[model samples]
Target: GGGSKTLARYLKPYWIFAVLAPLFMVVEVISDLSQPTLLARIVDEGIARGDFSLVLKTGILMLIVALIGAVGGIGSTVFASYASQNFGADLRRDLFRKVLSFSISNVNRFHTSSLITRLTNDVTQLQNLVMMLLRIVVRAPLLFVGGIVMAVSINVKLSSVLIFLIPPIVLLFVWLTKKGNPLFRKIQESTDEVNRVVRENLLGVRVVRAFRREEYENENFRKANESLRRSIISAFSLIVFALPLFIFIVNMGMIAVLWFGGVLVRNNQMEIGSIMAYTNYLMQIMFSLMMIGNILNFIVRASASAKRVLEVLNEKPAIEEADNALALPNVEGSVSFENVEFRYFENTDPVLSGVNFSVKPGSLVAVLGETGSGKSTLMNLIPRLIDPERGRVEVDELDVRTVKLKDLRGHISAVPQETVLFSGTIKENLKWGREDATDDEIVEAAKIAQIHDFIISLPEGYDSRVERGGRNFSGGQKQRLSIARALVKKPKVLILDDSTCSVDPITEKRILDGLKRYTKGSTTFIITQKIPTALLADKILVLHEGKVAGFGTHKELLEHSKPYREIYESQF
Candidate 1:
């Protein structure tokens, strides 16, 4: 019910088309209802009296009525298509915007493949439902009622067959819908699994090949495919069996009408032309019932998809801007965390506990931690990707939550361990940091990253094509380029989260040297396992099992901190 209510807003803009399409359908139904009666007149008044002129005139009138119905049908189809397609496009665009607004924790609630399916397959299901509603299905009940009225007016005795036949058909549809709704819901879930398997194979193609796990991957996909197939078969099997049963009931009703009408005709109690018109009305009623069944089939499936879409739309983002959020007046890049604690799940043990620390403006600090010591998680908090459960994170004395997310993130630049680049030219990728960056500014950042000479050696230089994920470049080269991308931002606070790991020591040293000049007076955080890199920082923050094990300069830590001494001794 909530899903349907939410979907109503998307239909608001196209309400005119929704109303008009059904209104035009009334014209088509009326035209259709007229033809049977006109044919009855031709049989009784024209042919029975041997008046050829009357037959010709009535036939021409029927043709004209049919032409009007045709125009109405075409108009309904056009309007339905126009409204549904545009509605779908708008809904998809809004859903994508909502997803982009999600925080890291909020996004983790759904699988990437599932989101894609909701945006594509679920949206299409709703679109089809909208089209069917406007085109003819909404008027199906009207046609059913009209057929019964027309038949009873012509002769009430034979129309009594409908009383016994209609109620059972209605009951059957209700039962089938109750059974089908849950099955269709299962089918959508299975479709999500199939999409997940396919997405994993495509994105991890290199890993699959390197491990030579092609056969293993194929078997996994086959299982998912088979499950999806079974779910679809179960969902549609009810429709397959129910449709023919419905038609059989309608067919039997027609036979009963013919039998009763024939008896009346033989006793001179009924006219043959009247029986003909009455039978035509029965056909119309039967067709309308079939349409009801088809529309119900779509409704059951769309209901499941509608609920899935609502699940996403209803989710309150984990991180939200405060009502009276402020903007940083001037950024000096001082960062602080007070009694910070975080866990992936509330019931689980915290990954970071009592993380109290402060970084002064315009200083370089290296955070050292072993694998799984929450190094990346700590840095992610600075960008407010994930908020701490029990503490406040501050940037320049304003609680990060108190400031606008865009304004806060705008002054800080972060380079993660993975170097992601879009499919574009080298210059275009670099310009992502600052869209208005001039070519000279781009080159200056590249120079600081120690990638400028390599760019100049290439024939296209800054214009060289970067393949998807920057696959055209080596790992080390991509890292440098990513660093340059961040450098172009000229951020007040800069973060390198093991971003220099791929480059060799010699190149790393040169990049560090260039970074010293570029990062002058700017606050920087370097998260690394390398002692050489940590030694270069003004101070070091040592982490062990999610606590601040030690914090001081390299010389002070060596003399006073056991964890710091162990890390330095192992690296050297």
Candidate 2:
């Protein structure tokens, strides 16, 4: 296992597929093998033998053989298609679920856009290869080797020509595989980058258009498109060249067979019909060689694809709960952080350094700080999105690392700074927070977020089709809707990170009031840029450069913490 390769290990689980594919392929190959012998009998025994009845009998036999081959080909293709598609789909689902289990810190190890590309486009490419491997890879090899055997069996003297031709043909295919494999790999990578660039551009299209950078974006896309073209063309050139080279060798072999066989026939040593049968077998072998060479090309591409997939499939997430962990349940949302020190990555400065904090159940805590002061980082720590490097985060009396991650998340609902929305109705969007939520509960939550009034004003009302990421909703509306979403879950610990920035000061006050009334006596973390909103909380925890610069009421912090004073002053 230590010296085991990645692709082989990843493919091991699909052994059932590995077995069935070749089984069907074996049937297909037997059918293919029967063709050349039948063709020879028709030409030599039926045609050259000059028996009209023999010709008719052989012709009918040839049609039946052709039908058998066609049926076997279709049956194998159908089986491979069904199996490969399902396997790819299952692999995607597994990858997605594995990604979900990974911590946010672990996820950052792989770029999000790259992961998405692998899950979709890469998986589809591999699936197509799987189908080909099932249908063609096995059959091609059998036909090529069998054709060689059958050709030599007909007349060993005529087979002498293959020795001179085979070596050069093999060398050409080897070169094509070696060079095209890397080029294909590069093409896949560039494709992921191009997707990332296009995705970023589309998401920020308004900015690009507003800044009059449409021409620049188009130029950027042109560069990506050109790169894609160059890679594919270079690889295709090799593939295209291999085919002509193979055909040249095949034709050369055919001329050698005709010239050498003619000499034997003229000398009265070999029968005319035997020479004809031998020529037919030689052509059959050449065709078989070409089919095999094409399969080798498929192998190269599939191998490249398999390597890319294995990179992701072999990954182990950095963060997961410790074994034999105890569960924390049914008490309060009191949290404690013991000597917690967290860094984003190696050599980077710590976001939180030896930080220790405690929150009693049902207390409203406000975290205040300037940009890059580790304010949001502190909020993220509570839910263990990113695990601390040196310390434990405890929920109730039990450590968070020891608690069931799902249970801990169930108790806390966070409306992050970056609000995300799916394409759906207003009702459907809110229902995401509580999957089985009633219509009444959804409308109630929306009203609490102060979005119900605006929603009812729309023509479609609750049934309206919202665009992805809530493009149809305004910034303020999106923020409030996010809050309503968090509210519907009725989590014990609710965290809002700057959710009111888009709303007007008046609307901010209204939403704040609604939050106070809705989550009364619940543990809450209200992180905000607005000083007025912080003043409503039970306590304000001012962070500066990843340290707790101040922790007290708004008035108390102002009187005592100068950093808090400056932050509050800056907000005005």
Candidate 3:
């Protein structure tokens, strides 16, 4: 009965459709109520008196009433779908936007499944509820009250049958609905599990196959599916079990109406037409209660979804604009970290500690590190993707925190360790790095990444579909395309975070030489494991235990740095 803030906001735009849909529904209900009274007139006036003219007149009137009822029903559904669909679409769209606004830290707070379910299935439940509100919710109550009133009008004595039967039926169904609602919530939980398992199997099919776990995954899928099947049957079995009981109760009321009405007819107290019409109204009243019970079940289920969706809508993003952040438009890209320290969480040991280094503007700086050595965390701080715990990361002598996040990230481009390409034409994927890039710029970037010749060799060339997850491209092929994406940005500060490892060393060398030409004096950082990747750099920084172990050209590192000298000899 309480108003939802999300519903209120979304419905505001479609309020007229909401209002009109139910109003037309009321027109349909009123038309339905008029029919039985008209039926009585035909029986008593036309058939009983043997008047064909009166039967003919009322029959045409009946047809008109039915056609009008159809019109009202059609009009109601048209408006209802418009309101509910738009409401759901707008809600889902905005919720997605809100999710996009969250910091990576904030996104880590919820499971991916919960966020996906909230956006899709939960919003759908609310949409179904909105449609019901306009149609079933209004019609059920209106028809119930109208049928009861019309029954009394036909024969006041005959109406007493409901008095004897309705109270117990009403009380019993109320109990049934209350018991059934919580189980309906159980079905929704099972629905979420079904979605989770299906998504997991599809996304990890490669892993499952490589590990030879098809039998295990099949068993797992069967378990969730079988559990879902059982819960649905349990909830519905109780409902289907109650149907016969309800039918029997309605029939008992039927005999009572006929039995009580039988004596009245024999006494000449009421006509046959009145008894017939009274029975019809009785059926209407009882059936409306059945409709109300199902809607009550739906409302409880929908109410649960409402709260889940609202939880997402009401969140304030943990990362947002600062109080007085600057939108600095341009800078020469010289990056520095001063006594930096960071950890993923408050209580954990720092991933990087007491790290300090400064890079000259427009130099290709290579950082070499072992796995879990906080090299990725170091690059992330430059783009302000994550903040450091205890020191400053600066670009062009300005603390990154002082700059607007958008304007700060604007000057930098990063190629992550994992190469991701969207499912689209090669040209479209490249354009994502810079939306308004000219054809020549895209071709130039592709050339530097050494993917241009391969792209041209394909039948579709730049227009070839990437396929979902870029499954069509292999590791080395996908990596070159990703590098092209970074090159397209033509950024001032470029961070290649182990992005070149998949391709062969010969091609990797050619790619680096091409990059040195394309850098045009913009700073570039290549984070790598292999020492060969650092040989061409103006300066190489060997990182270990969150501190710079060696900072010099390759010759200097081989000559003076102990760990660097050892790693160089070991790898070479």
Candidate 4:
């Protein structure tokens, strides 16, 4: 309900339209109310009594009422559609921005499949329900109540048949819907599971194909599909049984009305016209009662769907700046981790226990580690991507946590093991580092990355459109472009995480040499598996398991660190 209230608040600006739409719906409801009364008149005074003029007048009046209802209903639906779509769009935008604000760890809590379902499918379901509720569906109740009044007013004795039939049907639907609500909730959850499997399989189709496990993947999808189907079938079965039961009871009441009224007419106690009109009134009640069941079904399922949409819409972001937080002073690139301990989750084995390290301004430092050795975690700490739960991190004598996130990030540039590129022109990607970079400056950074000559050889050169994830380019070319992106930023600190692994040996050496010139005034940290690159560093910090194994210059480590020498020898 909180989420629904929050979503409803987004419609404040459009309240005028929202209010007017319902006004039109009211007009539509009144027009529908006229239909049953006019039909009763047509059956009683016109058709049964053989008055042609009465029939013509009543039929024309009925046509006018139907036209008014049709026009008003259409107008209301149009307005409600506009409002609901906008509301859903606003909800989606907020959810997306909220996801952006989350720390990487919080994003991990929700799987991509579930998040996508919340954004698209869940929102869509809720949107339809909201729009329908705001439109003719809401008018169903007004019509139902009006039908009840007209039926009793036409002939109380005949309409008394409702005392037996109407309550039973209503109660049956109520009971079935009570059971259906929880089942529908489960159905929505199963659909989310189905969405997860399909989304994963589609994105990982290459991996599935590479393993030649298409049949296995297909069977996996079938299981999810089967689970979803069973949930829906069960829900539908109840609905199917309810509708027929309702019709049977209502039709039986109609038969009773005919039998009881026939006796009255035979005794000359009632007119044929009265009996006809009474039967018509009974039909009105039946029609209205049927609408109640259908609308209730819509409301119940929609309530379940809306709750899921609201969960994401109302979620408080797990990461946001704290009030009264202070900004960091100007940095000198000195970083310190005081007794830092980090783990991916609470109660998990610490990845880095009591880890302590520091780097000076304009120094070249190399960090080493095996897979899952927490090297990436150590680098993430400097950028303040995740805060240490039980330690202090100082940058230039100021706690890194005290810094404004934007200012902190502005000073560091990193090239990750996985090169990330945008689907845009080379210049567009390069501008990401320094938005104000000139053409000459971009080309200079590219030259330092040793990619300018290659760029020049292409017909479009820097203007070429890099496809999705830079998939159109070779591995070395992509790595160089990422280097160019980092270099263009010109930050005080530069980090290369296995960034040179894809290039040839000569190009790699040239790239590293060029990096020295490019980062002349910045502290550079290079993480590489290659011994050749490690040997060129001014200092090296080797990590094994989750702790620092050794830290020294290459020559010093070679003599003092046996493990470092063995690693170097094996690589050679």
At residue 377, candidate 1 shows an lDDT of: 76
Q: How large is the C-alpha RMSD of every model relative to the true structure? A: 4.5, 4.4, 4.6, 4.8
Q: Where does the lowest 10-residue lDDT sum fall in candidate 2?
A: 1-10
- Which portions of model 2 miss their true places by more than 4 Å? 1-24, 46-50, 176-245, 304-331, 435-438, 466-472, 503-506, 559-562, 565-569
Tens-digit lDDT track for model 3 on 521-559? 699999987887877788888887677788889888888
lDDT of each: 0.85, 0.77, 0.85, 0.77
Q: Against the true structure, what is each candidate's TM-score?
A: 0.83, 0.83, 0.82, 0.81
Model 1, residue 510: what's the lDDT? 82
Q: Give the TM-score of candidate 3.
A: 0.82
What is candidate 2's lDDT per residue for 471-508, written digit by digit as tens? 87888888888888898988888888873366574776
Q: What stretches of model 3 exceed 4 Å from their correct place?
A: 1-5, 49-54, 112-114, 163-240, 266-269, 322-324, 343-350, 435-438, 468-471, 499-506, 534-572
Each prediction's number of clashing residue pairs: 0, 0, 0, 0
Q: Which scores higher on TM-score, 2 or 3?
A: 2
